[PDB]
RNA sequence: CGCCGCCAAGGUAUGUAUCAAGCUUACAAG
């Protein structure tokens, strides 16, 4: 309800942000409205951290609707924390976090080859999700001030205009 | 490949502003990108975001621009809708044959809804078949089966839906696509299907191949197998797509005439389904001899069961020893039952992916013996066709001739008849060579 | 897959045998409790036997539950009409939905209706309380014959000949 | 081949699948210039398929020849356009499967190809489209090809040059003689004959089709432009005009006598 | 469930959940050891395991 | 009439699709990764054996190939509406970039998908009764005595002043 | 592609004209050249007639 | 002793003249 209010404030109405946080044109935009409607990394990096939290919240709400159980939820959001990048496209707008994508994928191996020690099997079920959760929180630990500042400049330039030949 | 006038002597000596003088020629750069489109656009490297083009169904796994500009000129003039309409009208028009079923009253092409052809998340019924009363339909199975138990809801009307898709080298298996996506729409809740019965037909445009997965009212499956093998063989919209790929790709043949392809059984052998030929003529065979005494009699010496894979050249030669020619009765009349047991034992012995989808026997004496011995394998078609082959002339070549005659056991040997021809020529041409060599040895 | 059922799970089913065939309506008892209590209570009374489907707008709705047959006679088991019970995951996007029929305010009685298609004009105006189990949606598409004679009410409307209760949550007695 | 199938007439019906299969496969062939044999064979046997009750396979190879016209070889594309011309004749224009709404725009950049065979076949086809199918356009499009038919003069074959002036006449009868004529009057200052006498001829064609009094005020006007070529051009166009109209010169002789004096 | 404190704007604009987690570290490490054990015993003894269909 | 199965269990899955499986490619045991795994395994078991020629299959004479899809992930799909078409060569027949232009060079003005979507949502002289409506040469049906009085007025007709030439008929 | 270092061109260009229009513009250009040179020379005997 | 995994701009011009919602205060007032 606020990423959609930026779009309705800028009078776009040919882009559609849907409830799973994608953003899609619907009109083959002509080139005076191709140039007014593109967003930077302050819109898109916030849109994909919200897509990440929308997937985590949808996992817990799938559990508390009661149509998936606790072992299966634990494997669920272990897959979410281990396989972002494949399911959010957040690296695209801020590429330094690709390291942490790899750091999930690296430590996944640590856990996923000690579950499968002994007669346990090479399939899904590794619901030990603390070690990926931690690093995607340590991302947000230092991405709070940066894209808070990026959105500060975005909301300033939207609500008091850009300064042409100031600085 | 391309030959056409890249030298272009004095081209037609035009004026050439600036960017058409010194800029880079995009068109070989994008026909190369079109050419490897299954492996540059494969569906499962990162399996996250994919973007389907409008008016088509191609899905573009990546941000590759040159691939998109290559794959839009060959689906140029609304041609996905055009292939949809062409095949749906061809196989509503193949149901002018109405009374050869139980019956069909009408075949209603439903209202031409645009955007059906590439709406992938939802589907409609495409042509609906009404009936007088009570088609007793089957349970849903592919059209690559044979079993078709056919005991389910006796229903009035029977829809048919047709689906189109595109290649991409990791999902080119539409035996599976038709199954999965039939289930998806028939268990859906946005579906506007008029009956719980009918079939979904999937065809695979790049890598052109077809199947279906619905349930089958009695005289339908062997009808529509031929009825859409003819559509894949010949259809004008699905031919202008073919040649428009060829023209957006700069490929040309280099043969004088059409390479031996017709409505012959030669031609569907090589659709990467495993087909086997089976010769059983020489199971019983008798030597010609004079004894000590002047009398003339017959000796039942050991015979051969030839099983031949035309795509790989593999020749499964089963020996049938002399010593099972004693004790049994009706000796010229029990080989047809003692053959299908051994052939199904061969089916059971081989790996899962190497066993056939279709077996083509010689002159018909084993369709019901193979049907009753293949109870463990429902989905194998047993056919007799008009490519009768002189595998008896294989008993004239000496490496086979001594090995068939001098054996102490049901030995079950393997040979390879395409020696090293597949290094240089195709299965198609090596088969057209082998049947020449065997028929030439046979007649002389 | 990608198909996403997108509506809450049901509880409690009533088979209902009209002259067009057998229709097995399964209820959202938790998501709409008073209306589902009304419907299984009336079906358990055998209130709806010989009741006709007196209004067919083909492609839009087909109404029933009027034992007078004119379009106004409905007597709930609450005495007064009861409240509408909306839900954000129960909307009129498809066929097979079953909903109580209203005349404005919180006025829900016995008179209910099937949908026959998409009915987005009725969102937040009627109480969806059940869907129809598939392979029997075609028996209620038999109910939409173009026979209407008028803006409503065809020649020989289908009557409800029986009404079973295949599963009964929330204990009740008839009258 | 053409004479044989024209003799067999309707008895050639169980051989049209064999022939059309042989031709459609024959039209790939290493690019090895047996593709103008296939396209020429289509142009020769285009006659026998209408009189043998075959329009499905006509609708089948019309759309195929619609996209063999992106060739780089000129002599392949010329026989393609000859075949497509013969199909446009043997079918109606308004009932053909690569319809003229999206066939003529493919032909406007073909028209900038300076090979003589491709030019020749292209404007024969554009002439038949321009008189019999002028409702399949923008009427901007006819204007942006009647600037193409000035460069489609200076073509060393004289059949091109006498077909393009007919196409000016037909374009004019479509869109009116006040836009095509300002084009032909800017063309009169070029320094080149084969390019001014054959636009003078085109002025007489646009005169006599859509009656003079639509060309003759402006053509009378541009004698006042002080250049040698444009003055000899309007006099030569009055020559071809009176030669073409004949007995309608009873009405216009008093209008041009103060010019000729 | 884990109900948790929160801090929301009167306009309903934003809802900050206002708590630092704070676990006792032996009981936390032992709880994760507990479900390492229980979750190995569930992957060993499930007939076939399906994840979530992740959006 | 489709008779119901008459059981109280509801229509669909118990998890309501929360394990939807994406089964649009070749299944797990017949997949090419599994065939590769079979070949790897059987080449590991036969190691001390030296050409015992029992043949075992095609590959096994001595995870790449078509790769397996994640079953548990629906791919997020968009529409790539924006066509790559030279606006010039579409509506003019001439691109200034020649064949170096990065766009298509198409000239077909067929509708887009969204355009199809947003169309998809939407007597007589005396003015009396015909007292012998009777005719002249040229279709003119008049009343009888009224057209006789019309001839007394003017000898030609009323509709287009055509010469009756005395000719008057029923 | 070098989108920076490719030989540029602008959209809607209409292209470089053929030989007839180019050398007609050359003759008009050369006319303006000789007219301004005789204007600078202030020649009083240059006349251009009724036909160029 | 086992690198590697990719978004945006850069092209389909901009500049004028009439015609509503978006957003803006719900005010000073004989
Ligand atoms: O990432 P995915 O391809 O989806 O599969 C990963 C993982 O992949 P990476 O190791 O490339 O990160 C491994 O599978 P492979 O490497 O063999 O493809 C891993 O280790 P194991 O394969 O040894 O288990 C396991 O795969 P598996 O499915 O066998 O558990 C796991 O799978 P998840 O995707 O379920 O984490
Ligand atoms: Mg530039
Ligand atoms: Zn271009």
DSSP-assigned states of every residue in F12-53: S-SSTTTT-----S--TTTSHHHHHHHHHHHHHH-SS-----
Asked if F99 reaches chain D (Cβ–Cβ under 8 Å), the answer is no
Read out DSSP for B133-195?
A: S-EE----EESS-------S-EES-EEEEEEEE---SSS--HHHHHHHHHHHHHT-SS---SS
C102 given a catalytic annotation: yes
Q: How many C-beta atoms lie closer than 10 Å to residue A153's C-beta?
A: 12
Greatest C-alpha distance within chain E: 50
- Closest by Cα among B118, B88, B127, B71 to B238: B88
**Helix axis angle, B79-93 relative to B221-233, nearest 10°?**
140
B51 contacts in F (CB within 8 Å)?
77-80
The C-alpha atoms of residue B78 and residue B81 are separated, in whole angstroms, by 6
What count of other Cβ atoms lies within 10 Å of the Cβ of residue F20? Answer: 21
Q: Which chains touch E (3 or more CB pairs under 8 A)?
A: A, F
Neighbours of G30 (CB within 10 A): 11
Locate all alpha helices (DSSP H) within A2-127, ordered by sequence: 3-9, 41-64, 70-82, 98-115
B304 phi and psi angles, rounded to 5 deg: -130, 140
Q: Say if residues A7 and A17 touch (Cβ distance below 8 Å).
A: yes
- Measured N-to-C along each axis, helices D56-67 and D16-26 cross at an angle, to the nearest 10 degrees, of 10
Cα G15 to chain center, whole Å? 16
d(CA C103, CA C5): 30
Interhelix angle for A70-82 vs A41-64, to 10°?
A: 170
Range of the domain at C11: 1-175
Task: Measure the CA–CA gap between B388 and B390, rounded to whole angstroms.
Answer: 7
Q: Which residue in A21, A162, A8, A12 sits closest to A90, CA to CA?
A: A21
DSSP secondary structure letters along B264-295: SSTTTTTSSS-EEEEE-TTSSEE-----SSS-
Positive or negative, the Cα torsion across D113, D116, D117, D120?
positive
Q: Half-sphere exposure of B346 toward its Cβ, with a 13 Å CA cutoff? A: 26
- Angle (CA) B176 B181 B184, round 5°: 135
- Taking the CA of residue B53 and the C1' sugar atom of nucleotide H19, their distance in angstroms comes to 35
What is the phi/psi pair of residue D260, to 5°?
A: -75, -25
Q: Does G52 touch chain D (CB under 8 A)?
A: yes
What are the helix (H) ranges across B330-366?
A: 335-349
C-chain residue closest to B156, CA distance: C138
| Residue in A108, A124, A127, A128 to alter for ligand 1 test, most ligand atoms within 8 A of Cβ | A108
The whole-angstrom separation of Cα D197 and Cα D230 is 11
Q: How far is the CA of A15 from the C1' of H19 (A)?
A: 24
Nearest to B357 by CA among B196, B185, B177, B143: B143
CA–CA distance, D26 with D34 (Å, rounded to integer): 7
Count other C-beta atoms under 10 Å from residue A73's C-beta.
20
- Domain extent, residue B239, equals 51-252
- For the question of residue C63 being annotated catalytic, the response is yes
Distances (CA, A) of F16 to A62, C27, D19: 10, 16, 58
CB neighbourhood size of D204 (10 A):
25
In degrees and rounded to multiples of 5, residue B203 shows phi and psi of: -130, 155
Closest by CA position to C108, among listed C130, C132, C86, C75: C75
Residue F64 CB less than 6 A away from ligand 1: no
Q: Residues near G22 by Cβ (< 8 Å), separated by ≥ 6? A: none
C-alpha span between B308 and B438 (Å, rounded): 13
CA–CA separation, D166 and D130 (whole Å): 10
Q: Across chain B, how many H-helices and E-strands are there?
A: 12, 17
* DSSP state string for D164-197: HHHHHHHHHHHH-TTTHHHHHHHTT-SS-TTTSH
Cβ contact (<8 Å) for E50 and F19?
A: yes
Give the method of determination: cryo-EM
Q: What is the CATH number of the domain that holds B151?
A: 3.90.1570.40
Q: Which residues of D touch F110 (CB under 8 A)?
A: 102
CATH number of the domain enclosing C65: 2.40.100.10
Q: How many distinct structural domains can be found in chain C?
A: 1
B384 neighbors B152 (Cβ within 8 angstroms)? no
For residue D116, what are its two tokens?
A: 């003589």
Contact D70, D109 (CB under 8 A): no
Contacts of residues G15-23 at CB distance under 8 Å and 24 or more positions apart, as own/partner, are G15/B15, G15/B17, G15/F94, G15/F96, G16/B15, G16/B16, G16/B17, G17/B15, G18/B15, G18/D151, G20/D151, G20/D154, G20/D190, G20/D191, G20/D192, G20/D195, G23/D191
- CA dihedral sign of residues D221, D223, D224, D226: positive
Element (H, E) at C19: none
Residue of D nearest to B15 (CA): D112
Q: Does G11 touch chain F (CB under 8 A)?
A: yes
Taking the alpha carbons at both ends of chain E, their separation in whole angstroms is 22
- Chain D contact present for B239, CB below 8 A: yes
Contacts of C51 (CB under 8 A, 6+ apart): C64, C65, C66, C67, C69, C159, C160
**Measured in whole angstroms, how far is the alpha carbon of residue B267 from the centre of its chain?**
9
Q: Are strands B158-165 and B199-204 parallel, antiparallel or unpaired?
A: parallel
Torsion angles phi and psi, residue B9, rounded to 5: -45, -65
Strand residue runs (E) in chain C: 13-18, 21-27, 51-52, 55-57, 61-63, 98-100, 112-115, 128-132, 159-163
Backbone angles phi, psi at C100, to 5 degrees: -65, 150
Pairing, β C98-100 against β C112-115 = antiparallel
DSSP conformation class of F61: G
Asked about C82 being catalytic, the answer comes back as no
Rounded Cα gap, residues B120 and B398, in angstroms: 59
Q: Which of B247, B285, B277, B259 minimizes the C-alpha distance to B382?
A: B277
- Rounded to an integer, what is the distance from CA A124 to the centroid of its chain? 23
Lookup: tokens for G25: 């513009």
Helices (H) and strands (E) in chain C, counts: 2, 9
| Distance separating alpha carbons of residues B70 and B65, to the nearest angstrom | 9
**Proximal ligand: closest to the CA of B46:** 1
D52 exposure class (CB count in 10 Å sphere: 0-12, 13-18, 19+): middle
Q: Which tokens belong to B38?
A: 């299954």
């Amino acid at each position: 309800n606020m990423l959609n209010l930026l779009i309705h404030r800028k009078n776009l109405n040919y882009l559609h942000l849907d409830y799973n946080f994608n953003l899609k044109p619907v009109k083959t935009l002509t080139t005076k409205e191709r140039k007014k409607s593109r967003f930077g990394n302050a819109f898109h990096l916030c849109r994909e951290v919200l897509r990440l939290t929308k997937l985590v919240v949808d996992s817990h709400v799938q559990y508390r609707l009661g149509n998936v159980d606790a072992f299966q939820l634990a494997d669920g959001l272990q897959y979410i924390f281990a396989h972002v990048g494949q399911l959010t496209g957040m690296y695209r707008y801020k590429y330094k976090l690709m390291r942490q994508i790899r750091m999930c994928k690296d430590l996944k191996h640590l856990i996923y080859y000690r579950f499968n020690t002994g007669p346990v099997g090479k399939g899904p079920g590794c619901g030990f999700w603390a070690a990926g959760w931690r690093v995607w929180l340590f991302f947000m630990r230092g991405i709070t001030p940066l894209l808070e500042r990026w959105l500060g400049n975005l909301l300033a330039r939207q609500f008091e205009g850009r300064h042409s030949k100031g600085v | 490949w391309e030959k056409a006038s890249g030298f272009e002597e004095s081209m037609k000596w035009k004026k050439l502003t600036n960017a058409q003088r010194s800029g880079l020629n995009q068109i070989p750069n994008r026909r190369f990108t079109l050419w490897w489109s299954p492996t540059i656009n494969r569906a499962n490297v990162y399996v996250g975001f994919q973007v389907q083009l409008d008016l088509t169904g191609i899905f573009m796994h990546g941000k590759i621009p040159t691939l998109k500009i290559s794959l839009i000129q060959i689906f140029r003039a609304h041609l996905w809708q055009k292939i949809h309409e062409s095949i749906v009208m061809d196989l509503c028009q193949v149901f002018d044959q109405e009374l050869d079923a139980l019956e069909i009253e009408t075949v209603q092409k439903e209202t031409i809804h645009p955007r059906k052809s590439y709406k992938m998340n939802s589907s409609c019924a495409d042509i609906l078949l009404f009936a007088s009363y009570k088609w007793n339909v089957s349970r849903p199975s592919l059209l690559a089966d044979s079993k078709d138990v056919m005991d389910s809801t006796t229903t009035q009307k029977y829809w048919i839906d047709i689906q189109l898709r595109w290649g991409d080298y990791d999902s080119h298996d539409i035996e599976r696509y038709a199954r999965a996506k039939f289930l998806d729409y028939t268990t859906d809740n946005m579906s506007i299907y008029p009956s719980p019965t009918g079939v979904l037909i999937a065809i695979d445009l790049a890598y052109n191949l077809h199947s279906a997965y619905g349930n089958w009212f009695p005289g339908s499956k062997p009808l529509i197998q031929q009825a859409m093998a003819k559509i894949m063989k010949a259809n004008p919209a699905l031919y202008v797509l073919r040649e428009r790929i060829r023209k957006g790709l700069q490929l040309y043949s280099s043969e004088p005439t059409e390479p031996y392809l017709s409505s012959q059984n030669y031609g569907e052998l090589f659709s990467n389904q495993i087909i086997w030929f089976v010769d059983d003529t020489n199971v019983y065979r008798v030597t010609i001899h004079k004894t000590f005494e002047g009398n003339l009699t017959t000796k039942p010496i050991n015979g051969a069961i030839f099983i031949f894979n035309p795509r790989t050249g593999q020749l499964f030669l089963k020996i049938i020893h002399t010593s099972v020619w004693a004790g049994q009765k009706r000796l010229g009349q029990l080989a047809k039952w003692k053959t299908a047991e051994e052939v199904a034992a061969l089916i059971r012995s081989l790996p899962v992916e190497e066993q056939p989808k279709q077996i083509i026997v010689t002159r018909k004496g084993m369709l019901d013996p193979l049907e009753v011995h293949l109870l463990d394998f429902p989905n194998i078609v047993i056919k007799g066709s008009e490519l009768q082959l002189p595998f008896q002339a294989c008993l004239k070549v000496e490496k086979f001739g001594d090995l068939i005659l001098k054996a102490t056991e049901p030995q079950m040997v393997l040979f390879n008849l395409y020696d090293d021809w597949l290094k240089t020529i195709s299965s198609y041409t090596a088969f057209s060579r082998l049947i020449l060599i065997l028929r030439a040895l046979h007649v002389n | 897959s990608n198909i996403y059922i997108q509506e809450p799970p049901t509880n409690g089913k009533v088979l209902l045998k009209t002259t067009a065939g057998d229709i097995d309506i399964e209820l959202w008892s938790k998501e709409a409790p008073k209306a589902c209590r009304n419907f299984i209570q009336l079906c358990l009374e055998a209130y709806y036997d010989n009741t006709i489907f007196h209004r067919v707008v083909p492609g839009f709705i087909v109404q029933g539950g009027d034992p007078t047959g004119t379009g106004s006679g409905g007597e709930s088991i609450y005495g007064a009409p009861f409240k509408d019970e909306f839900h954000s995951r129960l909307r009129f996007n498809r066929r097979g939905l079953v909903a109580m029929a209203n005349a404005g305010s919180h006025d829900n009685g016995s008179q209910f209706f099937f949908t026959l298609g998409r009915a987005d004009e009725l969102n937040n105006k009627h109480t969806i309380f059940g869907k129809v189990t598939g392979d029997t949606v075609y028996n209620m598409l038999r109910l939409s014959e173009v026979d209407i004679d008028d803006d409503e009410r065809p020649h020989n409307p289908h009557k409800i000949k029986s009404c079973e209760v295949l599963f009964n949550p929330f204990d009740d007695i008839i009258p | 081949f053409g004479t044989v199938v024209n003799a067999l007439g309707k008895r050639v019906k169980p051989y049209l699948p064999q022939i059309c299969g042989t031709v459609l496969w024959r039209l790939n062939n290493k690019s090895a210039k047996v593709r103008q044999q296939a396209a020429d064979l289509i142009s020769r046997t285009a006659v026998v398929m209408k009189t043998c009750q075959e329009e499905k396979l006509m609708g089948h190879l019309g759309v195929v020849l619609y996209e063999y016209l992106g060739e780089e070889y000129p002599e392949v594309l010329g026989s393609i356009l000859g075949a497509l011309k013969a199909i446009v004749n043997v079918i109606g224009m308004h009932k053909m499967t690569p319809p003229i709404k999206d066939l003529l725009p493919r032909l406007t950049p073909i028209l900038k190809n300076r090979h003589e065979k491709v030019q020749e076949n292209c404007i024969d086809l554009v002439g038949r489209i321009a008189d019999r199918g002028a409702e399949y356009v923008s009427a901007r499009e006819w204007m942006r090809i009647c600037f193409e038919l000035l460069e489609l003069l200076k073509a060393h074959k004289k059949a091109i040059r006498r077909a393009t002036v007919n196409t000016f006449g037909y374009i004019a009868k479509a869109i009116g003689p006040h836009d095509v004529l300002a084009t032909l009057l800017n063309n009169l200052k070029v320094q080149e004959r084969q390019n001014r006498v054959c636009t003078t001829v085109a002025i007489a064609i646009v005169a006599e089709t859509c009656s003079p009094f639509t060309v003759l005020p402006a053509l009378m006007n541009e004698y006042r432009v002080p250049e040698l070529n444009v003055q000899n051009g309007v006099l030569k166009s009055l020559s071809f005009l009176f030669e073409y109209i004949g007995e309608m010169g009873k009405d216009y002789i008093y209008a041009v006598t103060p010019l000729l004096e | 469930i884990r109900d948790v404190p929160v801090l929301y704007h009167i306009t309903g604009a934003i809802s900050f959940v206002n708590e630092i987690p704070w676990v006792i570290e032996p009981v936390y490490i032992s709880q994760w050891g507990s479900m390492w054990i229980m979750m190995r015993r569930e992957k060993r003894d499930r007939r076939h395991f399906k994840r979530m269909r992740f959006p | 009439v489709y008779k119901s199965t008459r059981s109280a269990k509801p229509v669909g899955p118990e998890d309501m699709g929360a394990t939807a499986v994406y089964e649009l490619d070749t299944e797990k045991e017949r997949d090419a990764q599994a065939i590769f795994e079979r070949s790897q395994k059987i080449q590991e078991e036969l190691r001390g054996k030296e050409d015992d020629k029992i043949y075992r299959g095609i590959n096994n004479y001595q995870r790449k190939g078509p790769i397996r899809a994640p079953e548990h992930l629906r791919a997020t799909v968009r529409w790539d509406y924006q066509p790559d078409i030279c606006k010039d060569y579409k509506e003019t027949g001439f691109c200034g970039f020649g064949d170096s232009c990065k766009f298509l060079h198409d000239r077909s003005d067929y509708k887009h998908g969204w355009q199809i979507e947003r169309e998809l949502d939407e007597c007589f002289i005396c003015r009396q009764s015909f007292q012998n409506p009777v005719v002249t040469k040229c279709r003119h049906y008049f009343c009888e005595s009224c057209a006789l009085q019309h001839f007394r007025t003017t000898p030609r007709c009323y509709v287009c002043d055509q010469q009756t030439n005395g000719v008057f008929n029923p | 592609m070098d989108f920076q270092h490719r030989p540029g061109g602008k959209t809607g260009s209409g292209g470089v004209a053929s030989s007839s229009e180019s050398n007609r513009d050359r003759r008009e250009r050369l006319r303006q050249l000789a007219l301004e040179t005789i204007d600078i020379n202030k020649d009083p005997y240059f006349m251009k007639n009724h036909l160029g």
